[PDB]
Amino acid sequence: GGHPTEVLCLMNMVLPEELLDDEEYEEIVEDVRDECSKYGLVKSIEIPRPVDGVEVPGCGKIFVEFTSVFDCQKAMQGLTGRKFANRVVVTKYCDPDSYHRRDFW
Template sequence: YQIVNGKIEPTKILLLLNMVTEEELLNDQFYEEIREDVMNECKNFGNILSIKIPRPTENKELSNVGKIYIEYETTDQSMIAYKALAGRKFNERTVVTAYYSEMQYLADDI
């Protein structure tokens, strides 16, 4: 993987990967719990403006990579979370962090 040497360009949108399974997202109770758990942890690093946890729907098939998007008020805040959450365990899975384009996030292109 070439991924190691790429440049890191922070944005306000934190992308959390490898977090959840399709099965969990389909369960309403689990979905609410996941949202709550993620909010509770992520607010420790800054002010959250919005959060998006895509769920599988009839017309939209999701990849099995379990994505969660967090919009922070500032880039400094998302940078702290980006570092702090990488490698943490969630649901017995290893959390991977990335930044996402602010324009795409706001346009709901996720």
């Protein structure tokens, strides 16, 4: 996209119809927390859910946030083509102004 930041945009983890279970979602945060800390420190992860069946803009992504740009730059390449569920993971940079909000598309 544009300049790198400490966030990471990822796709092909979750499905538009699997973000419903409360006792699965919170495990999936910690699952990725352990894995991505191998390259730095994942500050947090951001998984917008559907609304009672309804789709939202920026659904079906995940964004991850690090505690330095320079660690995220290692992860983003180093974990291109990992499997953060069962599928592939493609990676991308994102912008953090949108990250801290729900400004997803």
